[model samples]
Target chain A: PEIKQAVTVRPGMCGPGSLFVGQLGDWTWETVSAQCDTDVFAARDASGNPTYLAFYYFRVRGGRELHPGSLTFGDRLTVTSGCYDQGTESVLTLHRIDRAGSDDAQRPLDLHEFYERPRDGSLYVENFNRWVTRSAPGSNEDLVKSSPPGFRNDGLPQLPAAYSPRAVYREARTAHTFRALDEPGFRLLPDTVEVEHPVDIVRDVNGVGLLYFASYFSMVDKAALALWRRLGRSDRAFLRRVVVDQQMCYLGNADLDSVLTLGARVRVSTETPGEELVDVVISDRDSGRVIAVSTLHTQHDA
Target chain B: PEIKQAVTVRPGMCGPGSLFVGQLGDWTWETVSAQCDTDVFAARDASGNPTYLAFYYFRVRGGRELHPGSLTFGDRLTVTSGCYDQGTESVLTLHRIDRAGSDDAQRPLDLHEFYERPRDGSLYVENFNRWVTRSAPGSNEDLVKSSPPGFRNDGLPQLPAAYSPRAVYREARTAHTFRALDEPGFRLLPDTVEVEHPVDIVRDVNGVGLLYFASYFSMVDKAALALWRRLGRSDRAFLRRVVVDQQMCYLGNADLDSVLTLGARVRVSTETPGEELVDVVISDRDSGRVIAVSTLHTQHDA
Candidate 1:
């Protein structure tokens, strides 16, 4: 099965057009039982305008093998092995690097990039370990964990710093403009008004026990303010009470299977301007128990 | 076999009040053949509220015995007959349905009345067989059928209508006001804003045959709009082209799953005075396929 002139594609096969055309080169090829690899490709036009080109490959027959070396940038090069002897056809594509393609640029080490980066959290790389490792074992760690079974990055200290305190504060302020939940009240009008709130719960690492709490906070924008105004239209008492005291109420047994695994409750809290701390708790009613409670600290300026 | 008995549960005898105090009386009590039987006893107050007294009898030493008397109402009774023979002395608690003297007038329910009303989508004797029915194999034409399985009053058209539509609408709207998905857009400063649309492909049901041309229409909501606005801040020309030409860039996948289920790509058009209709179209990246499409109407009628 190890036919000569075999063409194996790894990453880095950037193509020039929306379609990646691979012309046969001066070589023959044999089909194999392996997945043909592909890379994220991009193509640019004159004046450095880039057109998006994802990864694709195709093989054409009847044309004799010809070698036009050095696939000039933007040229569609169809790959052909030195010879064609196998049952299925084998072809290679000369891809171009579109500099303007989204997500095509090589990213350096950064806080945000740590999680989404392909090299750090890529699928195939997990298998590169000395032994076999599957996704089940992979679930133990956060998406940014360097190893499948390694400690989670949630509390890791070596994380790169990307966001400044000011930037984070602004983000929290932005999110508070809207109500946390979009529910209606006794008022006939809709809950579409926005309210001004500053600071928000980002994440809480520890609660009463070994549990941890984490969140993302942003200030509510104008649209959210509109919703709040609607909710508070009639007497504002109900809105005021629920906005501060209420949490989601659900019947037990909603999640019978996973309750044993994920725990009976996961509580999260929020800290907002004016309010010292807020708790957001998710409990499993079936077990007749209260789960983790998230005590949020919204006012970082405090 | 039915057992009749003169009952008396005088205070301090085993507990207080009139209670059933006999097992084998004027009628022969033939015990059931079950291997084990747990006999629990309780004597209600004059009002029949069991909060007064209750007891559990584990083993009865003697099984075959008889106490002679006829049973009737107002006769406090204490009876004993379980799988085991007489074992030890067990006491019964009395409860009162009403605070007054013994009389059926104060009972929660009469002999012919139901003890409790069904809540939720549960079906009970009252509404049974009204909505659905089941029949036997050869039950003739006029034979009455039993109520259908798994059918509840929720299926009834009158159920939602039973409550005021105003109330239901208020609840939904209030809940929406508190919902994060509906309110998250308020804080956004438009991280991105540009509209460019690729041509839309229309197809038949099976996606095999060609159909009419498809065009995409869209407008950014508070979240998208904020993102769009922020992008405009950086590049005003690009943002202008997107908004003016109605060119919609790829938003990729939605963060919320429910929105994804509603539609993949949403275009904003058909704007009324204060209402907006979001037209949704799903497209498959592979095969450049266009899938099912639908629309949702959202408004700011505050």
Candidate 2:
């Protein structure tokens, strides 16, 4: 038994429009996006319980169809989001349902899954409490849908009981490790370079007083550029190629005003015009402790 | 031969004052700080060279001395900074000269060193061109101290020709592998946790359209918290401890709107009162590529 709610997704909440299709030589561009409406509704298992589900509806439209002379509705998409807590694990699930319009095909939604357990038990407890209190019926009484059909869960899709991402990560980790194996037929190179940067508080800190996660990519870029410079390559040479993949691991927190050292090594290097893999490590300059490690894959332009 | 310059350090450049001296258990707040003046002058090896030398002045003051009832001057400090380029290597040097003042002993400056190499040779060249053109004499002709004593290299302290920070880093890296050896007499535990997060361009991107380095710390923090929660620890329990050190390595760059997975493993964990070490790794969700690794050290509250 559960409570269901309907929500409108606003355009602002939706991400940037995705480039769907375009003419290769011709400059004509076509972008498609699901712009969510603003209003959101929380569905809880109980009045005082944390929300177990949320509902939001969005419309998928193409830029080519919305030009001044020709405008038409395309597709309506509804998303159902849910979080489940088992005895020792936590999971989040999202399902998208697409309803066809005048020129589209309708289809049932498939489950998109992601899993994570919050670190601090108290924070999770507190957050759950906070969520329950904030999403209480009286908090947004005016915005609450009046028993909207979108909230009814009698016929919704089901999730398997023993779903986990453990195997997924285990397999991915093995495949991602850069190696010169007989099976892969690639040789690993040992050329390495290192650089150092100071953590500035003015531009680096987020609302939580810790360094933002994305900032590490900039540091990685700096490290990669250092390796390229060590090889006597110019920035133009490095920029000619594009980064197709990247990975980073975080072990601890770095505060403002700390000095960070970044080091880079070539994992796979070949002049045959393919992808090059580079490994980079960041550390504390004072303590010499490792902070994070990154692996980057770049495609050759020429 | 080199040209020297006198520059004033500004308050904005200095970090928060550090507590220098205090009695046990008495919160008699005594803070010492270097307050820099505003004016700065660039020094060069030659007339048109990149700035190889510079000068900045700061005064050390104490919080207790600044109190309304009791006022006193602490110390006036002068610093000389320089960079030297050797074959296949670059070195940066900073020297602190303590000028004698009332209630303090005066002494000649000894060299304190820090080292870094610019990542991109092109940027370095461009920067030198930009610096020479912008900080050119004509731009500051009126402000230049004509035949100033600070510009003369006759009596300046010297740095040994063999000074460099490479050996220091090389040796430190060997000692800080985040591993336990027979000599260290500690066993490494493999209890690990993992989590995933999405890159939000609105919160993660910098002016250059790439993730910032500081942001990684926030993501690391989020991962660490998730680990704590998985361990059934309260947020209060985790907050009671202090994070002592952290390190990170960047192997690649992540783009906007990508999904990142973070994995954490314990390097050192004990029920006894002491410090604990954890290792974390980040990777690309779709490509299964490793990006970065981090090592974090935390001291227990007990």
Candidate 3:
């Protein structure tokens, strides 16, 4: 059976305030959604350029342990989205955008007035296809090529760069802060506090003997606490504080018997009531490279 | 079928470093365990008082969103265990304790020498039973009493306060900061910043129409971010900071239509470069009652 374009909702017909009022960073009451249809809607700008808005990318990274590792209580992941717009020249506009109101100014509709649009290109579809290929690599490419039986491509219109599916939707430009993942040349911090922790099978392992991702946070927390304590603070007083937000990028794997040495660095000034950023690098102590990088923002009381 | 006593590990028969070397605060390499039997051990103190040790009491709390609400990057929960020892009279000891090489001094063995022990009680089992009863309410009590069919006692030796189960495996004591649930007059913190957010069925819900436990972290994060931004921090600057640890206590439930208002408060000093404790009280704006309380420790660098 073909995967059809199921139009479960239409503009205005969407329940009250169903429009994309702000970017994903808005995190406001108006943007939360329960169903896929509610999270998306079609809208026209003042000049009548139609736009499609929806929730797209959300990622969370954690490990198995309760404290120091458990992201079980915090909103560990942030969000961004893929926005689609059809201007006069191009049927599709692709850019890294969010649902917030401020992001409205960043859309391709503004670019349509001055810049010469691509004669033809499947911007939206190709970008999505490129992401699919990149996400799982060879496996996804194989699947796309084979077009396996029972895989449905619902009878929707496929535009080309000029006249075909490839030409109908054209890519547009937008400013992005962070480079794409494949972009090389990542750097590590100079100063770090190193602490070694043992990997336990019971507390750290998930299925198949691999350390659960969430468990890594526990080691990071321990590293932060150890660093702070070493910097001279009472255990009772230190324990009085809590973690506000944390981010992790996993580049490798860990297992039982692997001794993890966490190198943590606190980059905070001598001010009393502000935020401190602690970056922890987890690596194998015995002749190893970095396995993961955990960035923590810890709150401390003077 | 009755449950049987499975002896997978014996004291000296265990691998090296089998002793509890420190207080629960160590969080060192020696404390990680992969299997259940490896995590439990028996030992005799200097005066020859025997002890039984195992892992207990791991808890994780969350909000109503899916991935973004979960502290997928932060170690949201910390761990504590019950300590039991046979003193002169009492069989059970209760307190907040963690597993570590250095936490040994904080064990119940020290209290055993000074305080008179209770004479007649089921120290370990009763304390656990009491906790089970106290955890929820009359429902837990009814379940314990029914001890209905298929309940396997395994015929493990039951010990009185002094004898039997002798080697009477007992639960010991330690001073706890907070009382067990059901303690009277638990008050909410005053001076809060309230922010209303909607219930999204897609991002906020779990199975069926119910909100996922992890989803609440997103709202709390939003509340904290909103408060921080209001206090004059740029979104980019605030996003640079991450949560190190978070503690959540869920008192009730919220569904898809429930409009949640997160009330966040920063309890800390005004000086620069310190830790601020932000307490987010999640409630219904209309009815005005707390549904959950999130305690976040945020770091500020001046």
Candidate 4:
């Protein structure tokens, strides 16, 4: 028989699906970041064998309580699951449902979790084998928990062996053209701006750390904000359904001593009535290269 | 009367043409980094007014003493100056000449300084207005110093007005096509590799920090290392004349929570007998964009 348990979103918690990924590169009081994300808490595999998943990508879009410094202690998160392609080359996705918005508009943490098959010896295999994994009983160990037998939604496809991120990415990208819907109310506005951002030594990296994935996302977000501001939409805009496809690694790290000037361009698509679809391209500056090119789906709401 | 003075390279000192830029985003003990870079302890403007230069880009070539953890307290640095263009975009470059190696091979710290027009009001006007310039008389202020009337090299270009980085960059591009010399002993070898790097919260950022320029360069360096490793030359390799063209700023920052998988490609140009030219292209991963693409001139020595 398998098991299921509810977890409180706090610091020093880890497992297959947890809410510990964040902005800083270290595990300090600042990077606890309990408020910014929804918790994974617990997860199960489609197969009876135990499954482990690592933090990959997530997206949230709701309201005020979801903003940084809004959620307090004792907050609970709701979970949901989805799957793509059955059997070989299958991809599984789970989400932490936001409590504040309507069913269609609720913020959701869409995680394309890295799949780790239960090895006979270690449970922290895939999660710990990241760019730089340090797995020992000393410090970076996790509290490997398992969910109940037959607990995962059978509606989702059961993954086969060798179901890794690249495999998932190969298939996941097939559905997304990454372009705005060429449908009713479609209009694309070209806008460009240049903004310089300061890299801090303290916040922004993870406990172990590259600036965090979210931190890089924030760079793109900042450019998005700048692009909007240039178009005379200076109302503190927030992009939603944020999806990132990191093609390579960054050079090393950003520090407090220098500023990074980003060249940003956006093609705003005003097809969706209440929201907008903006395609963005940001410059890497250091190598005279383009760092990120993405299509954003954001709204003007609380 | 402008005065010339000699200053020791240590922590917590600043002015134009200082050796304060490095691999992290913060002002910690780690980022003090007295080694790795040569110092521009003092500088006088190409113009008679007090000229202040911020860190732009640099390149070095030399031996083991120039590596990390080599220099300690009491070590003195040698400085030199060069320039690009005249009047409109007078780019003044100061370099810290390495003490070791041959005259042609000694390490050098190239400082393409930002020109601050000395208003009677502040000496920090140009240096402070970086990407996100936070200027006040509080905490982040530099002790403004003036070089003697005979302090500058008349051989370099002198400024008129608006002689800033953008102006310098525009003119500097005229001198560089950034391509491998199609000359004797020249051939290109195709090499590619995928490497994952971790983001750190503390070590990678600055007192203020994005990942530092050096940190991102390290990412490129790691990929370069990885590419060379794949070429059966597994000995640790160091790159020289590390020039960069930062086309845009990074998204936010990378953190410890996740690993950045970089897709790196390198082309080997063996036009020179004693060395090789490596043209590198690295992927940003987050947006499926190219992060830094550059040609490196390096030797296989200490």
Candidate 5:
């Protein structure tokens, strides 16, 4: 259902406004069905630095998780593609060329061009990346944004409407340097839990990587798991079969100095008889300002 | 340097102490030089639930970041292998056994038995797993540990001293509800940053998964990246090629409801002339109790 062409890495890709100029020789996103090769591919950024890598699943529907390692230059990205159908996102087994297939090896790399595709924002590249930048909190103390890229060269990607239900999106965007998404229709259960996290640079890709929030459900899982435990379910039950049961929406962004506080509420799924639902609201720990919201469906392996 | 053994998914593996009874047919950690397979491997927990999946790089040296998806009971784990030497960790392409390899397909699964190997703690399988349980954080409000597995039938692993640094470890263990590690020798530079994060369910695995804090350098990278930028190098320069400059040590464990605060200080690397080093101390946000300490080296791709 797809074609396999050897595309050489180029200096500039996607569109003119593309800030990702990291394609040194071979890009990380190129792969197909049942293919394996130790090609000379340099997956790097403009400064000759390796770019961040990530993953997505579905017909670009849903999936998230940033790879632990970055694709480096002067290294071979050993890519192995197993299933190559448009139905399922192609599978690529990447090898970190430095460590010889030992403990730290075959990992994913950032292929920015992949997201820049149809640069029209039709793709579901959300959740996989979570970088976002807000202006210096309280001025003089903080000057330039540590992350270099912003609206200077590339404006942020205008995601799908389902993710960015505009009006609320506009309100948040206009007020802060961040974007917002639509809210969920589901309601929270009686049981609830609250949490907070310090924002790190990984979530900063220039007022960028906001799409990450749409799927940054790791916190949701943890907090929701807590709510589940509190509700008197099986103790030490392995949290299995989790589904992002609702339309997760974003309200804004946070800084490395900021704390993302989360509150999760559990409920019985309106549709799935055997599942439990949890709604989470993430906001500023100090200011208590809202940031993002999510809902998850899970069943403990009791 | 590895052999491809088309082994069938078996039940009950990784020694009896192993709480992972989820090898429903396919173990997640099996791969090689170059190969692709649609082999049917049912990955499930003892209760027939999908098991959590994760990754490790190095001859099992360092790297962290858990996969967003899990190995489900009825799905297919499409695996692709590339670069299978013992030096670098063997690469395996894992599909979600269900999602048409779509947005959420081809993700990693929990291959527990792999860690249980030699059933010995000699392996450096620390940071990859961040699960640890501190009894209910103020009790009756919490009864049985939400997570089932405890030092019950299976006990916690006795990790390497480099990570555990046992004396302080024993002190933290004997009294408080956790383990400790040797402290870092680096001093905090003039430029410093303080932060905090909520401990999620991911860091819990039966008074276990404490070793995860050893390589949990993500927070260190972000905080350090901040101190680097504050020093006025480049605005928006991507934080790149961060290295763990010092051996990370754990001071204790944090609960799901507990907060993990971090304070980072900047310094010039002791060895690398062109690098900047950041030392981070993770502690309880409220109590200010230390949880973990780490030093990282990073160069901004300015």
Candidate 6:
């Protein structure tokens, strides 16, 4: 049995809205959007568990309308918006159907991959996660409506995992903000988030809010690398990898040295610029934790 | 001088609103739009004579606003609009000053030809007679604030003559309807009378009460000719002339038969599946006018 009513927690609201998934019409979730003023960088773990960032959202009485005029805009996110894949596939399919004159054979389950690749990837994802889900509710046989926040389509009571568009975006921004604040040595990206398809939710409602983070790359540990004269302009390039490594630390050994080791080093390519040997290395300060490495060799004569 | 006080034309009354011509920017007429049904249409002859359409538009004082809410909601007509030749020449001066980032400067105004070419020789005349003159008002600009009954600029007194927007569309429509109902052999074209652009009036804000009628194209006696007999399938193809030869009434010998002796046949081309050689001659019985003559020819093997 699904939990009909739950004390939904939406600290950062995603607004009042539900999604309709096109696939198997199965995976769907209600989205309650909210924004966070503070930064909680990297809120999800390797296993994709929520580590920080709070939010809540409220459902319109009876049911919610999808258009902007009909929505019940509140300041709270009172439910767990089940963390779904932000089905990139679902978004693409909907966009294509809407754009190409809704020309397609009806299938039992909506295949997302075909839709996502049909056009620009980012646009497809945005349409899937936030775009298509109307500000108001609509009635269509193909569209499967997701339940209120914390409530799955199959009648299951979702945990405190409501997808807050505000939080999802904030988590992304916090990544960079945190890097800018605490990890000044490294650059953090606040954009880019993994996208999946089929919109996993109770109903096929594609109202799953996606967590997006930008990819950031900046210099980390310039003085120490400067001492070894091993760091260069290229060292800044790998800061993106280091940022990702740090976020993944909830699963991997994401340490300062480990992040540096994973990051790229200054290397002179022989394609266009001269074949100059540029010494590039990310070595551990305490010990030898350089699990992988690349060469920046130079050819003076040849 | 221009009329300053309110003028009463009564319900269902008909007459020129007020016509006065002066220097390029010395004309102005102001009339508070009333919701009374009547007729109005103004046309300026070559010598600037004001001939107007008869009673059609029902002027009203109250009803509903053109629309409900929002500046965006107002009925609007957005068609291909732009001044050609002007923007292109400005680039020559810009290039002399600075050439960097000037690639976009040379964009020729080729999107539409209606305003670009003088083939029809109508637009330029209309532009000069209507657009150029009205750019400045005549007489007391303060008291002569007349909303053009057909078309107008941003803060026009009413609709200006060309557009005949809903604001003053009734005036043109009333005249059009009266002509269609009273004239014989006259066909009506609704689309022609209706402005292609949406006039920003809606049901909420006293939408316009238009009395528009189909445009009329009266058929003259023998002036219509059918050519291309058996060249195509169903539809006829040929050439005919309206022997406006009467305007040449000054040239006494310009009669239907006489005009036919000259190359008076106009060309009408079509690829419909039909071939018919139809020769027609006509006389305007009402005015003892030898109006027009036509001829048709066809070329098809089958």
Per-candidate clashes, comma-separated: 121, 58, 113, 86, 50, 129
Local accuracy of candidate 4 as per-residue lDDT tens digits, B1-302: 11112323332111111112331121211111121121122223344332322333333322323421223222344433234332221223323333322253222222233232211111111111111222322222222333223332343344456544454334324322134345456555656777876543323332222234434544555566667767776331232222212221222233223356654444344553435555444444654544334344554532
lDDT of 6: 0.19
Off by over 4 Å in 4: A1-302, B1-56, B61-75, B80-93, B98-177, B181-184, B235-274, B288-291
Q: Which of candidates 3 and 6 reaches a greater DockQ?
A: 3
Best by DockQ: 5
lDDT per residue (tens digit) for residues B1-302 in model 2: 22222222211111111101001000100000011110112223334332311111111111212210111111233322232332111222232222223232222222331212311100010000001122343121111222211232233333455543343233323443333333252446655677877764433432223443334555666677677767667654554444434445433446654789888765445454556666666778776656555555665553
The estimated TM-scores of all candidates read: 0.15, 0.29, 0.28, 0.30, 0.35, 0.16
- Best-performing candidate as measured by TM-score: 5
At residue A173, give the lDDT of candidate 2: 38
Question: How much lDDT does each candidate structure score?
Answer: 0.20, 0.35, 0.34, 0.33, 0.33, 0.19
What is the per-residue lDDT of model 1 for residues B1-302, given as tens digits with 9 covering 90 to 100? 21122333211111100111111110111221111121111112233222110111101111011111111212243332222111112111111112122333223312122222212111111100011111223121122212222212231122123323233223323332211234423331213233332321110000111111111122222233333234332221212121101112221221111121112222223333323333333443433433323222333222
Tell me how each candidate scores on DockQ against the true complex: 0.01, 0.01, 0.02, 0.01, 0.05, 0.01
Q: What are the per-candidate TM-scores when only chain A is compared?
A: 0.17, 0.46, 0.40, 0.46, 0.40, 0.20
As for lDDT, the candidate ahead, 1 or 4, is 4
Evaluated against the true structure, the overall lDDT of model 1 is 0.20
The RMSD of every model to the true structure, in order and in angstroms, is 33.7, 23.3, 24.6, 20.1, 17.1, 32.2
Candidate 1 regions with alpha-carbon error over 4 angstroms: A1-276, A298-302, B1-302
DockQ of 5: 0.05
Model 3 regions lying over 4 Å from their true place = A1-302, B1-191, B269-272, B285-288
Interface RMSD of each: 37.7, 22.1, 24.2, 19.2, 21.3, 30.9
Candidate that beats the other on DockQ, 4 or 6, i.e. the better one:
4
- On the 0 to 100 scale, the lDDT of residue A148 in model 3 is 16
Interface RMSD of 1: 37.7
**Order of the predicted models by lDDT, top scorer first:** 2, 3, 4, 5, 1, 6
Q: Which TM-score value belongs to model 4?
A: 0.30
For model 1, what is the alpha-carbon lDDT of residue B155? Answer: 18
CAPRI-style docking class of model 5 based on DockQ: incorrect
